[PDB]
Design a protein around this nucleic acid. Structure first.
Ligand SMILES: [Mg+2]
Ligand SMILES: [Mg+2]
Ligand SMILES: [Mg+2]
Length: 92
RNA sequence: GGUCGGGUCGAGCCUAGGCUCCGUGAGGGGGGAGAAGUCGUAACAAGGUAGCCGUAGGGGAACCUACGGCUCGAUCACCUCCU
């Protein structure tokens, strides 16, 4: 339900790299090696192909970022119906 | 005191060669942490082919095989040597 606020933007998980590292495709047509904060790492399980919010790192904000929130099925369905995001971004 | 001649000592400077230090450096090599990637299961019980040492060959990877050695090897039957 919460939306990106600032430099944050959506993203689609592509492949997990191990040791809490994911490979997320963002809305600006860039692939980023993203790091999962440990606070939500322990309680929220993330799997390839999900809509998430990613904030790029302050330095070298082109290939690194942090994942802050995961969108459930109802939230992504509501977003698709509202029209803030399209279907081809999710499906690739 | 000037000028010239002779003998000797000499900091510095130039060239060549030989050693050595500092900065960058394409490319390559292992080491150490991390643990929400991956393929197997080598070790500990007889760990499911006992494990390990030396040498040599082979294999995605732990590993496998041959010759000589050690017990830091389990179970059953028989034998030997003691207290
Ligand atoms: Mg084994
Ligand atoms: Mg074995
Ligand atoms: Mg062979």
């Amino acid at each position: 339900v919460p939306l990106p606020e600032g430099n944050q933007l959506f993203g689609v998980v592509e492949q997990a790299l191990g040791a809490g590292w994911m490979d997320v495709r963002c809305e600006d047509g860039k692939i980023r090696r993203c790091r999962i904060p440990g606070k939500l790492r322990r309680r929220v399980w993330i799997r390839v192909g999900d809509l998430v919010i990613v904030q790029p790192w302050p330095v070298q904000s082109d290939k690194r970022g942090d994942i802050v929130y995961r969108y459930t099925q109802t939230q992504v369905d509501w977003l698709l119906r509202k029209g803030k995001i399209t279907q081809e971004f999710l499906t690739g």
